[PDB]
Design a protein around this ligand. Structure first.
Ligand code: UL7
Ligand code: ZN
Length: 195
């Protein structure tokens, strides 16, 4: 099966936000609103903001999952390639097979779905730090889009879902991801192609 990617703000007015990091050749993570697409280097910090209109209940969680964007591939599980799944770069919590990690959150949980076999990482939904208006999760993507035997140049989407303590849907958002050597250059290129 294919998880839904339908944008759904739900009762709490849930949606994502991204920083404005620009497109300098040195940039390591940058988001394109025109493409709804995040461009990042391998295993680098990707700040993703969580915005809500009202506070969700205690026990609310935030799950991240990757799927292939193209329908002929949508049904295939997104996972790390045969090289990276064996390079012993574990953080002690993430299974070596998982493409998406949450950085610096000891309460992160990693799921191998016993039915779909799809991977996800989920964390408690926390309130913003005092003085802030949103909450930020830091993600890492642990393979290149180009990795052979893995994503193999196929575009993926990340689906972020807001869930209750049972795992029921409260909210959903999504964005395309390209993990590449030069995010700044590739964003500039793909935005120019769109134009
Ligand atoms: O922002 C989060 C996040 Br993200 C996660 C969690 Cl668990 C809790 C909060 C607390 N927020 C809730 C929404 C509050 N504003 C009410 C007025 C409206 O005009 C703007 C939104 C601000 C405080
Ligand atoms: Zn790889």
């Amino acid at each position: 099966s294919v998880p839904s990617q339908k944008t759904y703000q739900g009762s709490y007015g849930f949606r994502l936000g991204f920083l404005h990091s620009g497109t300098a050749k040195s940039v390591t993570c940058t988001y394109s609103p025109a493409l709804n697409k995040l461009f990042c280097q391998l295993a680098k910090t990707c700040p993703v903001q969580l915005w809500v209109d009202s506070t969700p209940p205690p026990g609310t969680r935030v799950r991240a999952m990757a799927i292939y964007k193209q329908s002929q591939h949508m049904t295939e599980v997104v996972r790390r390639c045969p090289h990276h799944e064996r390079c012993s770069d574990s953080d002690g919590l993430a299974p070596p097979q998982h493409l998406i990690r949450v950085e610096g959150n000891l309460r992160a949980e990693y799921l191998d779905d016993r039915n779909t076999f799809r991977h996800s990482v989920v964390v408690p939904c926390e309130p913003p730090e005092v003085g802030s208006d949103c909450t930020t999760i830091h993600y890492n993507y642990m393979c290149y889009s180009s990795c052979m035997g893995g994503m193999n140049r196929r575009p993926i989407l990340t689906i972020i879902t807001l869930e209750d303590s049972s795992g029921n849907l409260l909210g959903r958002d999504s964005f395309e991801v390209r993990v590449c050597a030069c995010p700044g250059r590739d964003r500039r290129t793909e935005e120019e192609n769109l134009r």
